Design an enzyme around this catalytic site. Structure first.
Site, PDB file in Angstrom:
ATOM      1  N   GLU D  71       0.850  -1.184   0.000  1.00 57.47           N
ATOM      2  CA  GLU D  71       0.000   0.000   0.000  1.00 57.47           C
ATOM      3  C   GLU D  71       0.887   1.234   0.000  1.00 57.47           C
ATOM      4  O   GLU D  71       1.471   1.571   1.043  1.00 57.47           O
ATOM      5  CB  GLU D  71      -0.920   0.001   1.218  1.00 57.47           C
ATOM      6  CG  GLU D  71      -1.771  -1.240   1.290  1.00 57.47           C
ATOM      7  CD  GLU D  71      -1.073  -2.370   2.020  1.00 57.47           C
ATOM      8  OE1 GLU D  71       0.174  -2.355   2.099  1.00 57.47           O
ATOM      9  OE2 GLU D  71      -1.764  -3.305   2.461  1.00 57.47           O
ATOM     10  N   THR D 179      -7.246  -6.652  17.172  1.00 62.88           N
ATOM     11  CA  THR D 179      -7.710  -5.574  16.308  1.00 62.88           C
ATOM     12  C   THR D 179      -8.453  -6.114  15.097  1.00 62.88           C
ATOM     13  O   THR D 179      -9.445  -5.519  14.664  1.00 62.88           O
ATOM     14  CB  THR D 179      -6.537  -4.708  15.861  1.00 62.88           C
ATOM     15  OG1 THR D 179      -5.570  -5.527  15.194  1.00 62.88           O
ATOM     16  CG2 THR D 179      -5.891  -4.036  17.058  1.00 62.88           C
ATOM     17  N   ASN D 206       3.008  -6.181  22.100  1.00 62.30           N
ATOM     18  CA  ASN D 206       2.821  -4.751  22.307  1.00 62.30           C
ATOM     19  C   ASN D 206       2.264  -4.447  23.692  1.00 62.30           C
ATOM     20  O   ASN D 206       2.640  -3.444  24.310  1.00 62.30           O
ATOM     21  CB  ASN D 206       1.906  -4.192  21.220  1.00 62.30           C
ATOM     22  CG  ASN D 206       0.480  -4.672  21.359  1.00 62.30           C
ATOM     23  OD1 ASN D 206       0.230  -5.764  21.863  1.00 62.30           O
ATOM     24  ND2 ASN D 206      -0.466  -3.858  20.907  1.00 62.30           N
ATOM     25  N   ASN D 228       8.962   1.139  18.702  1.00 65.44           N
ATOM     26  CA  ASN D 228       9.914   0.848  17.647  1.00 65.44           C
ATOM     27  C   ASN D 228      11.333   1.148  18.093  1.00 65.44           C
ATOM     28  O   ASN D 228      12.256   0.411  17.734  1.00 65.44           O
ATOM     29  CB  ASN D 228       9.562   1.657  16.401  1.00 65.44           C
ATOM     30  CG  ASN D 228       8.082   1.602  16.068  1.00 65.44           C
ATOM     31  OD1 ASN D 228       7.454   2.620  15.776  1.00 65.44           O
ATOM     32  ND2 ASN D 228       7.526   0.398  16.075  1.00 65.44           N
ATOM     33  N   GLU D 254      25.763 -19.672  15.741  1.00 62.78           N
ATOM     34  CA  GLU D 254      25.844 -20.261  17.073  1.00 62.78           C
ATOM     35  C   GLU D 254      24.511 -20.167  17.799  1.00 62.78           C
ATOM     36  O   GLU D 254      24.125 -21.095  18.516  1.00 62.78           O
ATOM     37  CB  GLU D 254      26.948 -19.585  17.887  1.00 62.78           C
ATOM     38  CG  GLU D 254      28.373 -20.044  17.583  1.00 62.78           C
ATOM     39  CD  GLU D 254      28.855 -19.681  16.189  1.00 62.78           C
ATOM     40  OE1 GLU D 254      28.140 -18.956  15.466  1.00 62.78           O
ATOM     41  OE2 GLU D 254      29.972 -20.108  15.825  1.00 62.78           O
TER      42      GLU D 254
HETATM   43  N1  LIG Z   1       4.351  -4.817  13.247  1.00 66.76           N
HETATM   44  C1  LIG Z   1       3.749  -3.746  13.757  1.00 66.76           C
HETATM   45  N2  LIG Z   1       2.430  -3.844  14.108  1.00 66.76           N
HETATM   46  C2  LIG Z   1       1.747  -2.816  14.628  1.00 66.76           C
HETATM   47  C3  LIG Z   1       2.305  -1.590  14.846  1.00 66.76           C
HETATM   48  N3  LIG Z   1       1.323  -0.769  15.386  1.00 66.76           N
HETATM   49  C4  LIG Z   1       0.210  -1.533  15.468  1.00 66.76           C
HETATM   50  N4  LIG Z   1       0.466  -2.791  14.995  1.00 66.76           N
HETATM   51  C5  LIG Z   1      -0.376  -3.990  14.856  1.00 66.76           C
HETATM   52  O1  LIG Z   1       0.080  -4.587  13.646  1.00 66.76           O
HETATM   53  C6  LIG Z   1      -0.971  -4.834  12.727  1.00 66.76           C
HETATM   54  C7  LIG Z   1      -0.652  -4.412  11.296  1.00 66.76           C
HETATM   55  O2  LIG Z   1      -1.209  -5.405  10.466  1.00 66.76           O
HETATM   56  P1  LIG Z   1      -1.759  -5.087   8.997  1.00 66.76           P
HETATM   57  O3  LIG Z   1      -2.547  -3.810   9.053  1.00 66.76           O
HETATM   58  O4  LIG Z   1      -2.550  -6.252   8.478  1.00 66.76           O
HETATM   59  O5  LIG Z   1      -0.454  -4.884   8.092  1.00 66.76           O
HETATM   60  P2  LIG Z   1      -0.272  -5.429   6.587  1.00 66.76           P
HETATM   61  O6  LIG Z   1      -0.807  -6.814   6.381  1.00 66.76           O
HETATM   62  O7  LIG Z   1       1.193  -5.487   6.236  1.00 66.76           O
HETATM   63  O8  LIG Z   1      -1.048  -4.411   5.604  1.00 66.76           O
HETATM   64  P3  LIG Z   1      -2.182  -3.299   5.976  1.00 66.76           P
HETATM   65  O9  LIG Z   1      -3.434  -3.928   6.571  1.00 66.76           O
HETATM   66  O10 LIG Z   1      -2.607  -2.621   4.709  1.00 66.76           O
HETATM   67  O11 LIG Z   1      -1.612  -2.153   6.800  1.00 66.76           O
HETATM   68  C8  LIG Z   1      -2.203  -4.112  13.226  1.00 66.76           C
HETATM   69  O12 LIG Z   1      -3.299  -5.009  13.267  1.00 66.76           O
HETATM   70  C9  LIG Z   1      -1.839  -3.652  14.621  1.00 66.76           C
HETATM   71  O13 LIG Z   1      -2.656  -4.329  15.539  1.00 66.76           O
HETATM   72  C10 LIG Z   1       3.644  -1.472  14.496  1.00 66.76           C
HETATM   73  O14 LIG Z   1       4.299  -0.457  14.610  1.00 66.76           O
HETATM   74  N5  LIG Z   1       4.334  -2.516  13.970  1.00 66.76           N
END
Ligand SMILES: Nc1nc2c(ncn2[C@@H]2O[C@H](COP(=O)(O)OP(=O)(O)OP(=O)(O)O)[C@@H](O)[C@H]2O)c(=O)[nH]1
Ligand SMILES: Nc1nc2c(ncn2[C@@H]2O[C@H](COP(=O)(O)OP(=O)(O)OP(=O)(O)O)[C@@H](O)[C@H]2O)c(=O)[nH]1
Lengths: 99, 50, 438, 438
Positions: D71, D179, D206, D228, D254
């Site tokens: 996206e 979520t 988280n 992060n 290792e």
């Molecule tokens: N890995 C990561 N996850 C986060 C962060 N902040 C919130 N989240 C959680 O990580 C999830 C992101 O998943 P997705 O939204 O499916 O990400 P994606 O599949 O790569 O693609 P999109 O849905 O378009 O954004 C969310 O459901 C949040 O609950 C973050 O900074 N990093």
């Protein structure tokens, strides 16, 4: 002040003004900035009887950028790096409605 | 290159600093080479013409 | 010495001539006015420029080129542009009527009464020539004019001079993009008339140049300002060995002797590896290994033929800039050992390496890069016969219905030659098949 | 030499990557423009950056990373940050379509026409590299897109190379917070597809990260910048062994060879003890004994698993900054004597200790204070079975009601995988108790 106004002693079981609004950082800087706001609004309503865009910089932008800034397609035949950089200046002259 | 080997166990390929090359090189009609014009000397100079 | 004669036949040849010449003048500093200020590179008319200019008793660099055209429009625009004052006045030979995409129109109706003038001009250049390695002729198959006139000129200069050299570069019609349903006609006519005199002809494609331009150079709305400057870079690359010196050099005679296996078949392909724009050059890396890998990447080529659909028999490396033999041989050995390439058993080695120290040069308002390591690719393969199958079946139905033949019979054409063309093509076909066979 | 390639697939990986490379550049002293100050460390790509950045003849330390994102919004933002001239243009692979939280939408409809490009990038890194110790893949399980396309890229890299390690971090699905409701589905799909190909898959949560935040960071309203930043400092710690030097040394190979017991089970947990603030470090003081006690305090780990509800089997301790080995070994001996902890029989030796002398570094304007001693703790214990117990008695209800399967089947999927995954997981938990018992 008394002891410290820049900070109000961590774990302060008392409260502070300016709880909402700027918030979401560490504690001490929030204390400083919040009390700065608390004397700002103070003198602002004091006012006694007054009646009496890094997205683009110098050399344009990276390839494959999306988001229509004005024009491009209407003008063409140049390297996209140039195109962006020359739009970086002609966005001041003819499409100057960019601010 | 001997100095390059005078660094450590493994070699590393140094090179000329390209910055100087950009900021000093003939591009467009603007040259960057200067030219001097003189006469060879011997005990008695003969081909002074060239 | 080391000097060559350029022929620019046609609407298309003369423009890319202008562009490449605008290149040529820069790297020796020749001004749009054709005279330097006080400094000296002049002498007995004998120094690096002498390959293409002969700066005579008036201190004016004179192109060793000729420009012949039928419609006076573009020769007029270049007689009024920025370089008419340097171009020699009556070299720029103009006509008054077109060729109308008909081969026999340029080969029976117009080209006869101009060949005398053009041969006289080239002989009064050949006299002042001494070494005369050869002729760089630019025509085009689907040339809206030049095909028929080029056929006649080439055959006559071949028959009168059977000892000097002939090299042909020509933009090749596209596999699927069309500007003329008549293009197959003059394409096959020119082929069956030229395959027995052309020493080596080299084809590229405008679509392919465009595809490169919007994959890597990042040009989403090019023109051939861009792509002509590219092809000019290509020819400058092949001629840099002529111009400069270095460790070991290469020559067009070597090209003639060592690229083509057999008579008839003399059709290699051309490529330029480090096509790259400003920021990519600025803050990325180039070296012999990855540039060789890239130039052997199957999609970098200027004609859509699949190397897995083909097989290689010859390759020529033109390494310009700062490159060294150790990494040269290491890269080529790794490429050999890699198995995707499938060399025939004819040539256990299939490589001809050439070196030049002098880096390639940029052009104001251009797209190329401050590249220190460039390499020109000239490789002959077997993938191309698909294109000739393409052309013959693109031709056969349309001839079987005989569209537009009334035009040619009206201007004085018959059908024996059209018949002969397809068995010439099938000859080339079975020839490629048989040489591939092993 | 000693280098690893970074891959970030996703929504879920962009911000953590941004933070971690900001920390990298800060700690090596890279100016966000890209070059050094007047200090002389630009060279042939071989100094401390030779492990992470490809600083080449251009003088710019180029990260050896590729971000792929479905996206284009967030990737446009990251290009419109400040480090854009640092990062490599087409290493930022963007798309036009989301995977829409559907595992099979990500893995089938859109992914396949992007793997060609990502493979091209990784192979053009594979040619230049020589050490190629492995990869750092960042994704999630509660990801709308970080699931399926990530699985596919994992499969291709596994099938082409089985000769390098595969390290995976993950922000794990929150146990009781969800979520997305497609979360359990696509998560278990990822797990059962990835079990037979993943070398070392690690998790973090988280909710517990936030719990640390308002416990001892004294931050009742932290952010992503903070989260992060913490995870980035964690990975910096695990790569400190590669970057700096030290008395005794360990490598990620290792880690794999010495932490996982058997086939299958390779999902341990991690922690960082000295998480404190400016005034806290100011008028408090850290030392080895209490950093050990804190790092083994039951709450401090970032997943809600009680060690007293489990049993330890493996531990790897990474101390960074100044330390003497005496107190280290003494404190670990005392913890061996401890009566609340639980070690299974198999591991009388279970402590892989590794020292680096270089202190951990701070980020300007951030939360963490100056650090004299720091530790990364990597422990594997039987406790985590309860989380998968939770996930299974969640997914079972949705399957009983055949909820939301219509989307997947309509975009073209069948019950097979949906059935298979449950007994894949069941085999996982049954092995968990089989090894936990004695
Ligand atoms: N890995 C990561 N996850 C986060 C962060 N902040 C919130 N989240 C959680 O990580 C999830 C992101 O998943 P997705 O939204 O499916 O990400 P994606 O599949 O790569 O693609 P999109 O849905 O378009 O954004 C969310 O459901 C949040 O609950 C973050 O900074 N990093
Ligand atoms: N060299 C060159 N080619 C051009 C130019 N403009 C268009 N073209 C190319 O010219 C090719 C076609 O040439 P032709 O249509 O056969 O032109 P011609 O037969 O010589 O005579 P004209 O009637 O003037 O066009 C196409 O493949 C275009 O890519 C130009 O300015 N220079």
């Amino acid at each position: 002040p008394n002891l410290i106004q820049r900070k109000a002693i961590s774990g302060y079981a008392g409260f502070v003004p300016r709880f909402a609004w700027v918030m979401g950082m560490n504690y001490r800087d929030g204390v400083t900035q919040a009390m700065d706001d608390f004397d700002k609004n103070q003198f602002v309503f004091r006012h006694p009887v007054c009646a009496l865009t890094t997205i683009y910089r110098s050399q344009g932008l990276i390839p494959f950028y999306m988001g229509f800034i004005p024009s491009m397609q209407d003008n063409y035949a140049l390297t996209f790096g140039n195109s962006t950089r020359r739009a970086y200046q002609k966005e001041l002259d003819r499409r100057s409605h960019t601010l | 290159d001997s100095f390059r080997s005078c660094v450590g166990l493994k070699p590393t390929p140094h090179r000329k600093n390209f910055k100087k090359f950009m900021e000093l090189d003939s591009f467009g009609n603007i040259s960057n080479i200067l030219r001097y014009f003189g006469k060879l000397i011997t005990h008695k100079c003969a081909d002074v013409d060239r | 010495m080391r000097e060559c004669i350029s022929i620019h036949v046609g609407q298309a040849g003369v423009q890319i001539g202008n562009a490449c010449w605008e290149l040529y003048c820069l790297e020796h500093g020749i001004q749009p006015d054709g005279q330097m200020p006080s400094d000296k590179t002049i002498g007995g008319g004998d120094d690096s420029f002498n390959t293409f200019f002969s700066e005579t008793g008036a201190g004016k660099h004179v192109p060793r080129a000729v420009f012949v055209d039928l419609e006076p429009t573009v020769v007029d625009e270049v007689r009024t542009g920025t370089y008419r004052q340097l171009f020699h006045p009556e070299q720029l030979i103009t006509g008054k009527e077109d060729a109308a995409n008909n081969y026999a129109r340029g080969h029976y109706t117009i080209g006869k009464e101009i060949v005398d003038l053009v041969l006289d001009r080239i002989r009064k250049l050949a006299d002042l020539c001494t070494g005369l390695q050869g002729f760089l002729i630019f025509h085009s198959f689907g040339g809206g004019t030049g095909s028929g006139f080029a056929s006649l000129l080439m055959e006559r200069l071949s028959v009168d001079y059977g000892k000097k050299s002939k090299l042909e570069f020509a933009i090749y019609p596209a596999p699927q993009v069309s500007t003329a349903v008549v293009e197959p006609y003059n394409s096959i006519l020119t082929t069956h008339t030229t395959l027995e005199h052309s020493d080596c002809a080299f084809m590229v494609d405008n679509e392919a140049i465009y595809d490169i331009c919007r994959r890597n150079l990042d040009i989403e709305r090019p023109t051939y300002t861009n792509l002509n400057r590219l092809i000019g870079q290509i020819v400058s690359s092949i001629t840099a060995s002529l111009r400069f010196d270095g460790a070991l050099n290469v020559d067009l005679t070597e090209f003639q002797t060592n690229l083509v296996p057999y008579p008839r078949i003399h059709f290699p392909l051309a490529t330029y590896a480090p096509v790259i724009s400003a920021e990519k050059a600025y803050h990325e890396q180039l070296s012999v290994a990855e540039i060789t890998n890239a130039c052997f990447e199957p999609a970098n080529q200027m004609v859509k033929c699949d190397p897995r659909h083909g097989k290689y028999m010859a390759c020529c490396m033109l390494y310009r800039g700062d490159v060294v033999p150790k990494d040269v041989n290491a890269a080529i050995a790794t490429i050999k050992t890699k198995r995707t390439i499938q060399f025939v058993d004819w040539c256990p080695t299939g490589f001809k390496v050439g070196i030049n120290y002098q880096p390639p040069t940029v052009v104001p308002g251009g797209d190329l890069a401050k590249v220190q390591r460039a390499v020109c690719m000239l490789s002959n393969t077997t993938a191309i016969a698909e294109a000739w199958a393409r052309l013959d079946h693109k031709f056969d139905l349309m001839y079987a219905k005989r569209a537009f033949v009334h035009w040619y019979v009206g201007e004085g054409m018959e059908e024996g030659e059209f018949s002969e063309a397809r068995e010439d093509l099938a000859a080339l076909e079975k020839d490629y098949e048989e040489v591939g066979v092993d």
